[PDB]
């Protein structure tokens, strides 16, 4: 019963990211044969990665931008992506979608960017981090180089990432992982919160069984993980003040809708 519910959740985890962490290390390992991740380390290789990723804009003239107002965006339709996936998943975990239609939303609303950030450890190592569905990696100390406030936006999460990866997580802890992050039972504006808890609590319980079976030689693993979920509520909020800098501070730099809108009344 509960390796059932471990699994449905792993198989929707599988389904439903486009990316994951076992192929994830194949492209950042070096190995893997055709279609090679294009390494964007300065001005002169991040315009040669948008003639090839992304030919309608740079016909638009996107390249007469400046390069942090490219990445900025970049970032956010990765975002988009990313979410709508997370929504798919999140409709793969048991008991989520007999949830009041309010409180799903509520739950990705707080969530996904917590999750986001957790699963982007998977395509980051200590040089860069994978973008562009594989075809493209993007050094740490490139995005470092843009000029502030967007030299903050991607630092703090290689942060975290280093150690989360220290943790040698695979997908299967990965997909618990992510399924306790969105059926959280205290986020605000929730209506049904006793429901929500009772779902939480199994899978928090089926995630504590699966690091047992999966990690027996790390004895604090499951409130090491607990610890990184505050981590990322942290993480978020940080990222959402520096998200709303942005969206004052700096024109040409609108925010998507979607993205808008879970922002809006969060924190
Ligand atoms: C690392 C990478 C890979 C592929 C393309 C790009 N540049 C982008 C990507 C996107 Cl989604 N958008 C833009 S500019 C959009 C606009 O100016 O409204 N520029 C970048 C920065
Ligand atoms: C899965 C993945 C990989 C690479 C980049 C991104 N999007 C990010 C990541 C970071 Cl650290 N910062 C941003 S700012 C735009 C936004 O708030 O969605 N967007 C995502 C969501």
Do not use: W
């Amino acid at each position: 019963d509960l390796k059932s519910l471990a699994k449905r959740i792993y198989e929707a985890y599988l389904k439903n990211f486009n990316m994951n962490k076992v192929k994830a290390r194949v492209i950042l390992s070096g190995k893997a044969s055709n279609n090679p991740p294009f390494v964007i380390h300065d001005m002169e290789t991040l315009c040669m990665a948008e003639k090839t990723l992304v030919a309608k804009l740079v016909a638009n003239g996107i390249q007469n931008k400046e390069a942090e107002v490219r990445i900025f965006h970049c970032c956010q339709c990765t975002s988009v992506e990313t979410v709508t996936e997370l929504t798919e998943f999140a409709k793969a975990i048991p008991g989520f979608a007999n949830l009041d239609l309010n409180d799903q939303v509520t739950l990705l609303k707080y969530g996904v960017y917590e999750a986001i950030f957790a699963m982007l450890s998977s395509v980051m190592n200590k040089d860069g981090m994978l973008v562009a569905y594989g075809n493209g990696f993007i050094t740490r100390e490139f995005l470092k180089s843009l000029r502030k406030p967007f030299c903050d936006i991607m630092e703090p999460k290689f942060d975290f990432a280093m150690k989360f990866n220290a943790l040698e997580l695979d997908d299967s802890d990965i997909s618990l992982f992510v399924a306790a992050i969105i059926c959280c039972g205290d986020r605000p504006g929730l209506l049904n919160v006793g429901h929500i808890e009772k779902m939480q609590e199994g899978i928090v319980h089926v995630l504590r069984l699966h690091l047992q079976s999966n990690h027996p030689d790390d004895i604090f693993l499951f409130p090491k993980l607990l610890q990184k979920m505050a981590d990322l509520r942290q993480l978020v909020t940080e990222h959402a003040q520096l998200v709303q800098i942005i969206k004052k501070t700096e024109s040409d730099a609108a925010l998507h809708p979607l993205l808008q809108e879970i922002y809006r009344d969060m924190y």
